[PDB]
Amino acid sequence: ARFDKKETIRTMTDTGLVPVFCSCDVEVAKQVIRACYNGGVRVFEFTNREEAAHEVFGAVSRWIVEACPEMILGVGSIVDAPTASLYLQSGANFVVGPLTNPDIAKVCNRRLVPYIPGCGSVSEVGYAQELGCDICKVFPGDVLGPGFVKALKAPMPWSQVMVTGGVKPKEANLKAWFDAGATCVGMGSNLFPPEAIASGNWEKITDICAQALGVIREVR
């Protein structure tokens, strides 16, 4: 359907896992979303990386209302404000990017749509917060590491961080990030082995998602 900022933040916080998938093929995207939904995933991020990716997103967005009615769909890899506006027109419930662009914050704030900008320093986290961003994306996480989140959260306990990059659906990796204070994690390649997609092994996608979500749940 369409979910307001309150539900999106809460659902992201509670599940703690945001799959990150390409906008390649509409039919492949539907299957990945179906497999993730069955695994318990309720927030899903499409990336704006292929040509006319917003057209794939629009098709999936209209289909997902009946197919996976509790899935909250959002867009990632956004670096400019007009493209963020375009996906808001297409039904995006949250906007994520690898960097921070204040113009995007302005356009997202105008519709109370959560903007999750990429941050790579404690100052960048703070400026994003000043812009009204409730969740900041620590990116790339493998570069900054769990210690970055732990160090930031001590003087800035209000901070809520999504970690993306270098997160794995393994218990030792997930424990490290959530013990450090992460609110949710984003994952792409590690949630969908390219082998499993190519052969249509969707139950494998469901299982990895379920297992990762289960580890997050007992960590919390």
Numbering used by the authors: 5 to 224
The study reports:
Chondroitin sulfate A is a linear, sulfated carbohydrate linked to periodontal disease as the principal species of glycosaminoglycan appended on the surface of cortical bone of teeth and in supporting dental ligaments. Through genomic comparisons with B. thetaiotaomicron, a new PUL-like operon (Bfo2285-Bfo2295, and Bfo3043) was identified in T. forsythia and the crystal structure of two proteins from this PUL-like operon, Bfo2290 and Bfo2294, were reported using X-ray crystallography. Here we define a pathway for the degradation of CSA by T. forsythia based on the discovery of a PUL-like gene cluster found using bioinformatics analysis, functionally characterize three proteins (Bfo2285, Bfo2290, Bfo2291, and Bfo2294) from this PUL-like gene cluster and report the crystal structure of an exo-N-acetylgalactosamine (Bfo2290) and for a 2-keto-3-deoxy-6-phosphogluconate (KDPG) and 2-keto-4-hydroxyglutarate (KHP) to D-glyceraldehyde-3-phosphate aldolase (Bfo2294). As CSA is the primary GAG in alveolar bone, this likely serves as a mechanism by which T. Forsythia compromises periodontal tissues contributing to bone loss in periodontal disease in conjunction with host osteoclastic activity.
The structure of Bfo2294 was solved to a resolution of 2.20Å in the space group of P23 and iteratively built and refined to a corresponding Rwork of 0.179 and Rfree of 0.221. Bfo2294 was found to have an α/β-barrel structure and contained a glutamic acid and lysine zwitterionic-pair typical of class I aldolases which use a Schiff-base mechanism to convert KDPG and KHP into D-glyceraldehyde-3-phosphate and pyruvate. Key residues highlighted in yellow Glu 49 and Lys 141 form a zwitterionic-pair critical to the catalytic function of Bfo2294. KDP was modeled in orange as part of the co-crystal structure of a KDPGal aldolase to show the orientation of the substrate in the active site. Enzyme kinetic studies previously conducted by Eshaque et al. was successful in showing that Bfo2294 is a KDPG aldolase. As the enzyme was found to be dependent on NADH as a cofactor, the enzyme kinetic constants of Bfo2294 were determined by quantifying the decrease in concentration of NADH by measuring the decrease in absorbance at 340nm as it was consumed in the reaction. Analysis of substrate specificity and pH optimization by Eshaque et al. also showed that the preferred substrate for Bfo2294 was CSA at pH 6.5. The assay was not repeated for KHG, however through multiple sequence alignments and comparisons against structural homologs, Bfo2294 may also be capable of similarly degrading KHG.
